[PDB]
Amino acid sequence: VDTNECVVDAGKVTLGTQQRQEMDPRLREKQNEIILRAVCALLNSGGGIIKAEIENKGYNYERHGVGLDVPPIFRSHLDKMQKENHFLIFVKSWNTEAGVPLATLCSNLYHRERTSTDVMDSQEALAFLKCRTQTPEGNINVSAAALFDRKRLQYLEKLNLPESTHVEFVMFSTDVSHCVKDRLPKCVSAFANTEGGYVFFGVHDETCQVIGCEKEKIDLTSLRASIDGCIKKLPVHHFCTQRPEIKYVLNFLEVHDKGALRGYVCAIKVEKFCCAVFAKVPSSWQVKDNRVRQLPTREWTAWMME
Ligand code: NA
Ligand SMILES: [Zn+2]
Numbered sequence: 289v290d291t292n293e294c295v296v297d298a299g300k301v302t303l304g305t306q307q308r309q310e311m312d313p314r315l316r317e318k319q320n321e322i323i324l325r326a327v328c329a330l331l332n333s334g335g336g337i338i339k340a341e342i343e344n345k346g347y348n349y350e351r352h353g354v355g356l357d358v359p360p361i362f363r364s365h366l367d368k369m370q371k372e373n374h375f376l377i378f379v380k381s382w383n384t385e386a387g388v389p390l391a392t393l394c395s396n397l398y399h400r401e402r403t404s405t406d407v408m409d410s411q412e413a414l415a416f417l418k419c420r421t422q423t424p425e426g427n428i429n430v431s432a433a434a435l436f437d438r439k440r441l442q443y444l445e446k447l448n449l450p451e452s453t454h455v456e457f458v459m460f461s462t463d464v465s466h467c468v469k470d471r472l473p474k475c476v477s478a479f480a481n482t483e484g485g486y487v488f489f490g491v492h493d494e495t496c497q498v499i500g501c502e503k504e505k506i507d508l509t510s511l512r513a514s515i516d517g518c519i520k521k522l523p524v525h526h527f528c529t530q531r532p533e534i535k536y537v538l539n540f541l542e543v544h545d546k547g548a549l550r551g552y553v554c555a556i557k558v559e560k561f562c563c564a565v566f567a568k569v570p571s572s573w574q575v576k577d578n579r580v581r582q583l584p585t586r587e588w589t590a591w592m593m594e
Pocket of ligand 1: 433434436438439
């Protein structure tokens with residue numbers, strides 16, 4: 289995202305509700321993300337102008353609409369204009385809007401309530417950080433503990449353990465390495481930032497039935513390694529002196545059917561964390577040295593703490 293009085297060039301974009309509906313999805317998402325990062329940078333850099341070349345001929349803003357997906361909190365800071373094949377976005381300074389020091393596309397601080405794991409919005413993130421910085425408790429879920437260390441389950445058995453603040457069920461995807469790399473950071477962030485809990489990979493959430501990953505698609509010792517590497521890779525911010533690593537425990541449960549081993553469930557208990565666990569670096573941006581730049585976790589947190 290090039291900078292060029294702060295003018296940000298977002299490149300070529302397709303415009304219009306219908307036109308963006310029908311366009312290539314990966315390109316649609318890429319353009320929307322370029323625009324949003326440019327918006328976030330300018331909100332955090334005193335405002336500016338985004339310019340973009342409209343690539344679909346015959347585009348007319350008043351009849352066709354825009355078709356970009358923008359967080360509603362950001363919309364009050366934006367104006368938009370079409371001038372022939374060019375599109376302009378007027379971005380006004382964030383200016384401590386909503387009591388949050390800076391604009392953020394995604395805090396990447398997850399939390400869990402009942403059966404739902406969700407990312408914290410900026411105000412939730414701020415309240416969470418303020419609580420964790422000011423701090424200075426029994427079994428988390430014994431039914432889940434009993435399930436966690438079992439050696440074997442029956443294919444398609446329905447578990448009596450329900451999902452809850454402390455229990456999440458997640459399906460494996462076909463590429464289990466991508467499954468863990470994409471989903472586990474959110475689960476670990478959420479459990480560490482909430483009350484701790486257990487995630488069972490290979491259990492279908494809507495039915496609570498044991499599925500497992502086919503044994504031919506799993507190498508146990510390397511999956512255990514990759515889970516450890518995923519968790520060690522998670523950004524954290526401490527307000528404490530001891531600064532412990534995230535604590536977790538992993539067990540592989542065998543899934544049997546018709547008297548043969550068929551697959552595995554991956555059970556992970558994540559302890560409640562002293563401070564903050566991020567699924568990945570917060571998605572917050574600024575203009576710096578004539579470039580759109582993501583804030584490091586430490587800088588984002590420091591700005592958040594005022
Ligand atoms: Na156990
Ligand atoms: Zn800590």
